[PDB]
């Protein structure tokens, strides 16, 4: 099947410029164009290029100065760069591509690429344990948690017991502290029956910082 | 370049009903347009092209109408699965642009949140700070409130909140609040509490704890 998988989300500084890959599996780049788009809260999605079977480039009339897309067509690669940037080229960066080689009706895209564009430094997060509660554990059902606080950039990606837990997560938007630092909690229902025997690890992956932090959730003694 | 105007901004809709999204584009497009769907933390998946064209994969339900400047994406029979953004874009006009999105609500009956606070653990404290969280978990509608009281002195400044995007499974939101202090405030008072208010409940519900107990 079609596949468009991009490179990790970080951090550049004003001024600064961003680099990102996309590696396609399930068709060649010698015959498809590969498109660029971006998402952001201020200004929806946009296109921003585009680069053909042949090596052919078309640039969005905002970026033609400051973007470049080439590839390595022997190894499936796409590589989107984009100079000069500022904080409203804060965005997830999407690769895809077309159902016909020359067409714009964006049938396969990658899974985005979230672009911070700040002065700050990137900051690691601190994880805790919301351990469950005896008295609140509602109709034989217990809540639990993990708290990832104080990291800069944005994203971190939390899962449960290595992704074997889904049911009943829930992941909250983060929110940017006074510190200009984000913080996020992480929460589970799971049955009370199980809390003796079953056990609950929080992971919280933050690519900017390259850290990984696994977090055993317990009841308290 | 063409501009595609989307409203309105949030569709609520029972389940079961047909719902219809409008999208509009500055100057004539043909029958130039794409529909996207964008569900929460995904990447878009295309539905419609060419106004009408259906896609491989796509369920029947969704069909798209029109041509020239006045467009329709339909659900026929909406289920909670479709629970996300839509999208359209043109591309008669160079550049190809998109409109800004409507987002698809489900209605459900209403739900009172089930409510669950968090002390502070003790790593944590060990480095001078004491989070306190409050969980307001799968109530409907949207709107809820959350007031923070500490020894029954009601808290202002030292919180932050967010809430979830809907659930696509049962149609509810989530909310979380944490109320953020020094160690040593923490430590100098007794109760801390979280009062929460919602369309569900005829009283406000109250979690607390005694800090040590």
């Known amino acids: 099947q079609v596949q468009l998988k991009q490179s990790g989300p970080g951090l550049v500084q004003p001024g600064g410029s961003l680099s990102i890959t996309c590696t396609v599996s399930?068709?060649?780049?010698?015959?498809?164009?590969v498109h660029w788009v971006r998402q952001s809260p201020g200004k929806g999605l946009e296109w921003l290029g585009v680069?053909?079977?042949?090596?052919?480039?078309d640039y969005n009339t905002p970026f033609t100065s400051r973007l470049s897309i080439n590839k390595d067509n022997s190894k499936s690669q796409v590589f989107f760069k984009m100079n000069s940037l500022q904080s409203n080229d804060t965005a997830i960066y999407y690769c895809?591509?077309?159902?016909?080689?020359?067409?714009?009706?964006?049938?396969?895209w990658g899974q985005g690429t979230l672009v911070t564009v700040s002065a700050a430094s990137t900051k690691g997060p601190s994880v805790f344990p919301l351990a469950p509660s005896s008295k609140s554990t509602s109709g034989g059902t217990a809540a639990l948690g993990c708290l990832v606080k104080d990291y800069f950039p944005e994203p971190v990606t939390v899962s449960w017991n290595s992704g074997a837990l889904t049911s009943g997560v829930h992941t909250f938007p983060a929110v940017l502290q006074s510190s200009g630092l984000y913080s996020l909690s992480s929460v589970v229902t799971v049955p009370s029956s199980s809390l003796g025997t079953q056990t609950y690890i929080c992971n919280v992956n933050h690519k900017p910082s390259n850290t990984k932090v696994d977090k055993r959730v317990e009841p308290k003694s | 370049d063409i501009q595609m105007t989307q409203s309105p901004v949030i569709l609520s809709v029972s389940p079961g009903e047909r719902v219809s999204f409008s999208c509009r584009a500055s100057?004539?497009?043909?029958?130039?347009i794409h529909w996207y769907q964008q569900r929460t933390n995904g990447s878009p998946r295309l539905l419609i092209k060419?106004?009408?064209e259906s896609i491989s994969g796509i369920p029947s339900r969704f069909s798209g109408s029109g041509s020239g400047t006045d467009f329709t994406l339909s659900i026929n029979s909406v289920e909670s699965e479709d629970i996300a953004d839509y999208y359209c874009?043109?591309?008669?006009?160079?550049?190809?642009?998109f409109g800004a999105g409507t987002k698809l609500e489900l209605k459900r009956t209403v739900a009172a949140p089930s409510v669950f606070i968090f002390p502070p653990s003790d790593e944590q404290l060990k480095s001078g700070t004491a989070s306190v969280v409050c969980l307001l978990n799968n109530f409907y509608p949207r709107e809820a409130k959350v007031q923070w009281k500490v020894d029954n002195a009601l808290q202002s400044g030292n919180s932050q909140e967010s809430v979830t995007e809907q659930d696509s499974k049962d149609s509810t939101y989530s909310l979380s609040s944490t109320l953020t202090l020094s160690k040593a405030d923490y430590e100098k008072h007794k109760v801390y509490a979280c009062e929460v208010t919602h369309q569900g409940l005829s009283s406000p519900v109250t979690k607390s704890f005694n800090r040590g107990a």
């Open positions: 895809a591509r077309a159902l016909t080689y020359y067409d714009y009706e964006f049938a396969y």
């Open positions: 399930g068709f060649s780049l010698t015959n498809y164009g």
């Open positions: 680069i053909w079977s042949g090596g052919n480039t």
């Open positions: 100057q004539s497009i043909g029958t130039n």
């Open positions: 060419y106004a009408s």
């Open positions: 874009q043109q591309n008669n006009n160079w550049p190809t642009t």
